[PDB]
Design a protein around this nucleic acid. Structure first.
Ligand SMILES: [Mg+2]
Ligand SMILES: [Mg+2]
Ligand SMILES: [Mg+2]
Ligand SMILES: [Mg+2]
Ligand SMILES: [Mg+2]
Ligand SMILES: [Mg+2]
Ligand SMILES: [Mg+2]
Ligand SMILES: [Mg+2]
Ligand SMILES: [Mg+2]
Ligand SMILES: [Mg+2]
Ligand SMILES: [Mg+2]
Ligand SMILES: [Mg+2]
Ligand SMILES: [Mg+2]
Ligand SMILES: [Mg+2]
Ligand SMILES: [Mg+2]
Ligand SMILES: [Mg+2]
Ligand SMILES: [Mg+2]
Ligand SMILES: [Mg+2]
Ligand SMILES: [Mg+2]
Ligand SMILES: [Mg+2]
Ligand SMILES: [Mg+2]
Ligand SMILES: [Mg+2]
Ligand SMILES: [Mg+2]
Ligand SMILES: [Mg+2]
Ligand SMILES: [Mg+2]
Ligand SMILES: [Mg+2]
Ligand SMILES: [Mg+2]
Ligand SMILES: [Mg+2]
Ligand SMILES: [Mg+2]
Ligand SMILES: [Mg+2]
Ligand SMILES: [Mg+2]
Ligand SMILES: [Mg+2]
Ligand SMILES: [Mg+2]
Ligand SMILES: [Mg+2]
Ligand SMILES: [Mg+2]
Ligand SMILES: [Mg+2]
Ligand SMILES: [Mg+2]
Ligand SMILES: [Mg+2]
Ligand SMILES: [Mg+2]
Ligand SMILES: [Mg+2]
Ligand SMILES: [Mg+2]
Ligand SMILES: [Mg+2]
Ligand SMILES: [Mg+2]
Ligand SMILES: [Mg+2]
Ligand SMILES: [Mg+2]
Ligand SMILES: [Mg+2]
Ligand SMILES: [Mg+2]
Ligand SMILES: [Mg+2]
Ligand SMILES: [Mg+2]
Ligand SMILES: [Mg+2]
Ligand SMILES: [Mg+2]
Ligand SMILES: [Mg+2]
Ligand SMILES: [Mg+2]
Ligand SMILES: [Mg+2]
Ligand SMILES: [Mg+2]
Ligand SMILES: [Mg+2]
Ligand SMILES: [Mg+2]
Ligand SMILES: [Mg+2]
Ligand SMILES: [Mg+2]
Ligand SMILES: [Mg+2]
Ligand SMILES: [Mg+2]
Ligand SMILES: [Mg+2]
Ligand SMILES: [Mg+2]
Ligand SMILES: [Mg+2]
Lengths: 64, 84, 51, 54, 96
RNA sequence: CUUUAAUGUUUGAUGUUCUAACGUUGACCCGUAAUCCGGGUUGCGGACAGUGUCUGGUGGGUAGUUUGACUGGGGCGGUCUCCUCCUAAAGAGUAACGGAGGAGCACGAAGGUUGGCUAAUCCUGGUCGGACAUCAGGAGGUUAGUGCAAUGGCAUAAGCCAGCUUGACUGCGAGCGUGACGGCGCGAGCAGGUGCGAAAGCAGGUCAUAGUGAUCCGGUGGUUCUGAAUGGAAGGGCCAUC
RNA sequence: AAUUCCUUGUCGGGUAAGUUCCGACCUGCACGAAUGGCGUAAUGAUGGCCAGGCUGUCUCCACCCGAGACUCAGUGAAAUUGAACUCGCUGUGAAGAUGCAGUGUACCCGCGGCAAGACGGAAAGACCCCGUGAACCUUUACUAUAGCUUGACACUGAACAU
RNA sequence: GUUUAUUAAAAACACAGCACUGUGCAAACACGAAAGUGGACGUAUACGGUGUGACGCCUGCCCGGUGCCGGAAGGUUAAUU
RNA sequence: GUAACGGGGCUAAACCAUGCACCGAAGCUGCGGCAGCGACGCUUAUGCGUUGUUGGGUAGGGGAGCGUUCUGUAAGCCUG
RNA sequence: AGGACCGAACCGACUAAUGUUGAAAAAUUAGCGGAUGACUUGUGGCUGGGGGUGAAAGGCCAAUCAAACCGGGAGAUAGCU
RNA sequence: UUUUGUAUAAUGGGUCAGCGACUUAUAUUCUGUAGCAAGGUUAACCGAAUAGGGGAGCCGAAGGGAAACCGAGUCUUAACU
């Protein structure tokens, strides 16, 4: 029957305009006092899923 | 004398190689902000239009071509960026 | 480790706070500093508070 | 396996031409006999050489 | 999503955001669909009747996409800057 | 105002009597020819015992499962992440239960800047005071120092003092380097607002490389972004952070 | 020593010679008092050792009587089997060759025998390792739970005194 | 005497005897969601459990640990309010 | 069981040096044939003068087919 | 008198040889143990699968037992062949 | 067959004949091909029923943002070179 969306991947990835996926950078949930502010500033903006993991996320998330 | 004896070793530790060394060699043409050499301590020094980061990484501050030269009284090695 | 974590709250009333580590035993005196406050975009006195 | 071994004896790698033993103050023939006796205890072919200016 | 037991991508990356329920009842209309209504008035239920938007939509916005070549009177919708300029160039009116 | 008489008054508790619930595997009568059962009379116990729900304890009596990997076969022993040198074959990278050592931090200053200074060791002379304390001169040349390992650096000092200080800033970031990826690092320059300096200028931590853990789930503070009829709020999101 | 490793402990007895046996010593790796200690008459298809008698158990086999094996007539299986025109040696080789190389030998085919090889036949090794395999068993492994037990509330009420 | 029917008959199990321990009778304990039944138409010279195993001479010290029994003062402690 | 040239055997039929022949593979060439790709003819239906190269192959990827039963064409066609 | 003695039936199964595609999926031959008892045996009944029963071996429960057999979940799953 | 590697003395098969292993359903993506083309297409169902009707709905033509919201821009930020 209908393929089922991997709900975790649906929560963590969003689809864009040409087919890429935007995700949130890791390393920003806790242990933040010891992380330099430059590092956190770079980790705030959303990033793009790389080519290698494109296949994984696409298979996980067919109704994206 | 049947099977074997035994005895542990105290070593078997090491660290991830850092990929230091000259990235762009002499004669190459770099864009501004290109890392020319990653190093531990100023083995190479910052010449013209070349900046030295905190980890003594030399990066070109201006577009152009790399140029190594021995310079100064201590015969040290300076990386300069000829304007191109 | 031996250093605890403290937050320097702004005295400009923004509620903004920096965070840092402090040696409680060797420097029992509180810590005050002039640190930039993005909310009011001015350098203001930041004083120590528990995390 | 299980690590390296323990040091058991010390050697000195010998390459051809290395002048192992030297002797002075004795007659030449007695030096030859002494060097023959010594070389008989070594696992390397040897030869008898003399001093020269250069 | 399996990767050999290594923590998969959709688990080592953090979740983010929430889903907006009002975005499921808001919709968009192109300038081309403006002439596809009837009577020249672009009411919300007029668009629904012309099947430009779904039945349970309750908000709508006209955007600079395509072109409009007839006088219309966009009533009750929100209009972008470029769409407003294009409609007023076409001789249309932009009610509240 | 850490006391009791209070008109007792509403009430827990305890204790003592009662009988009417309930128990009776006491006796007798009846259905009934029936040591089951039920009904009656009676004796005893009696709000106890016992059962239901909730709850703490105990619980291998019973049940479901877990009990890592590498490995010169497995076990035992040792190791598992990070930093430094060698192996490593003059770019990068490169294994072994290969050879050596360290880390799980420290610092409000040991950071920034401005100004200034230059070490180890030995010899000579000198009160206590010597092989080694402080003083003076010389030789020496960085054989010192670098908060902690080793390497590479360091005299313009990155080594040592002193003044003022908070750039151990907020939003970005051309371009690179490094990774399968997650990620990690370097970074001029731009905007705001600061420190030091007469100024040029330097400053988004420490001479550099270790000093650390993703996600989820939650906690705290902002943020009216959303807030299922409407207004709020709960909650959720975003930002900082545990 | 049903315990004792070193160890065939040492001393004595038994034997020509005794790692076993018997009696002792005590240096009990690592006995010990109801997961009993030390003895103990009788009992044992019980374990160890010794002697008399007796013998083909043996020196060392010999002969004989029967049932097969052997031949003839009748009936008539089985495991196994890639195909075979199915030799020895030396070497080579997935490292132990009927089959490769070199070489020697060998007319074709049965019958009775033997069992050295065909890594012979049987049984998807029981030993070993592995599987994020299974089962039963254990416990002060984790999580539960029947049972036992505690209190509250209910069935459950009265009088009185503190 | 019994025992691994079908590789182990034994030094194993049982045994009479001994000890500890539970149990006052609607007994403990066991089978059973319960009724009920066994124990027993028995009653502490009885019944259950555990260990040792005729008989003779005996059975020494330790209660720290783990259990079991007794205690209720104090500490910590659930539901409920 | 010779059994440390493969054997025969060899005093050169051994070793060294100089040479010149010859043997020697599915290598190269000759003849004939098929095919893939590319350029070029430029035809464009797969003929497309021609030409140059290419064609060992496991896991695997791509292209093209054979054959079997059944359905339509088929109340056709073949067949006592 | 006796869980007495010797020894047939009856019950067992200690040694040896045979057999080990057997005459037999545990027997035969020669010896062997108990043989008035905790014996043996016929007939009928009762106890059932995490359960029975067990003078205890993890033994027996229809040639099957560290959890019978039959049907179903079921084409369990098999990173293995 | 499995392997770095088999004549291997590693596995399988005595032989023949018949049977025996990448399928089906529904979704999703890519390719080829056919129709239509900023459009494409219908599903249940109705139907003289492979027609026709049915456009409910789905995909696409607009993206950015967690979101309100903005919109060929949008987000970040007080604002972007
Ligand atoms: Mg957060
Ligand atoms: Mg290593
Ligand atoms: Mg893991
Ligand atoms: Mg519609
Ligand atoms: Mg268990
Ligand atoms: Mg399970
Ligand atoms: Mg292992
Ligand atoms: Mg271990
Ligand atoms: Mg290198
Ligand atoms: Mg190299
Ligand atoms: Mg410093
Ligand atoms: Mg400094
Ligand atoms: Mg340092
Ligand atoms: Mg509301
Ligand atoms: Mg809120
Ligand atoms: Mg002895
Ligand atoms: Mg003697
Ligand atoms: Mg003796
Ligand atoms: Mg003795
Ligand atoms: Mg004992
Ligand atoms: Mg003992
Ligand atoms: Mg005892
Ligand atoms: Mg005993
Ligand atoms: Mg007996
Ligand atoms: Mg005798
Ligand atoms: Mg015959
Ligand atoms: Mg051979
Ligand atoms: Mg042979
Ligand atoms: Mg024969
Ligand atoms: Mg044989
Ligand atoms: Mg034979
Ligand atoms: Mg065999
Ligand atoms: Mg096997
Ligand atoms: Mg038996
Ligand atoms: Mg037997
Ligand atoms: Mg006993
Ligand atoms: Mg005792
Ligand atoms: Mg005690
Ligand atoms: Mg006590
Ligand atoms: Mg107690
Ligand atoms: Mg010989
Ligand atoms: Mg040829
Ligand atoms: Mg080919
Ligand atoms: Mg047909
Ligand atoms: Mg008798
Ligand atoms: Mg028997
Ligand atoms: Mg008999
Ligand atoms: Mg008899
Ligand atoms: Mg007898
Ligand atoms: Mg008898
Ligand atoms: Mg009887
Ligand atoms: Mg069952
Ligand atoms: Mg056993
Ligand atoms: Mg059976
Ligand atoms: Mg089971
Ligand atoms: Mg199932
Ligand atoms: Mg089944
Ligand atoms: Mg199956
Ligand atoms: Mg192998
Ligand atoms: Mg071969
Ligand atoms: Mg063979
Ligand atoms: Mg074979
Ligand atoms: Mg096979
Ligand atoms: Mg076979």
């Amino acid at each position: 029957p209908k393929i089922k969306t991997v709900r975790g991947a649906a929560k963590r990835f969003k689809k864009t305009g040409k087919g890429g996926f935007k995700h949130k950078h890791a390393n920003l949930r806790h242990i933040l006092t010891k992380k330099a502010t430059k590092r956190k500033r770079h980790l705030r903006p959303k990033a793009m899923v790389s080519k290698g993991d494109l296949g994984l996320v696409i298979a996980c998330l067919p109704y994206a | 004398a049947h099977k074997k004896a035994g005895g542990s070793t105290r070593n078997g530790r090491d660290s991830e190689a850092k990929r230091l060394g000259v990235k762009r060699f002499g004669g190459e043409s770099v864009l501004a902000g290109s890392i020319i050499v990653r190093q531990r301590g100023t083995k190479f020094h910052a010449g013209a239009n070349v900046g030295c980061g905190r980890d003594h990484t030399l990066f070109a501050k201006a577009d152009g071509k790399v140029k190594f030269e021995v310079k100064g009284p201590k015969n040290r090695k300076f990386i300069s960026i000829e304007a191109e | 480790g031996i250093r605890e974590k403290i937050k320097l709250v702004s005295s400009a009333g923004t509620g903004h706070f920096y965070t840092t580590t402090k040696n409680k035993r060797t420097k029992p005196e509180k810590l005050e500093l002039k640190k930039f406050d993005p909310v009011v975009r001015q350098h203001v006195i930041y004083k120590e508070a528990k995390i | 396996g299980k690590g390296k071994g323990n040091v058991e004896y010390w050697v000195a790698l010998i390459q051809p031409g290395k002048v192992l033993y030297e002797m002075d103050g004795v007659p030449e023939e007695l030096a030859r006999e002494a060097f023959k006796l010594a070389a008989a205890k070594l696992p390397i072919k040897t030869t008898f050489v003399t001093k020269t200016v250069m | 999503g399996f990767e050999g037991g290594q923590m998969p991508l959709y688990r080592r990356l953090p979740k983010f955001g929430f889903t907006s329920r009002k975005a499921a009842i808001t919709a968009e209309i192109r300038l081309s669909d403006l002439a596809k209504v009837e009577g020249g008035v672009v009411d919300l239920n007029t668009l629904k009747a012309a099947n430009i938007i779904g039945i349970q939509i309750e908000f709508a916005k006209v955007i600079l996409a395509g072109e409009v070549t007839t006088p219309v009177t966009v009533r009750g919708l929100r209009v972008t800057k470029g769409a407003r300029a294009a409609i007023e160039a076409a001789g249309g009116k932009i009610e509240e």
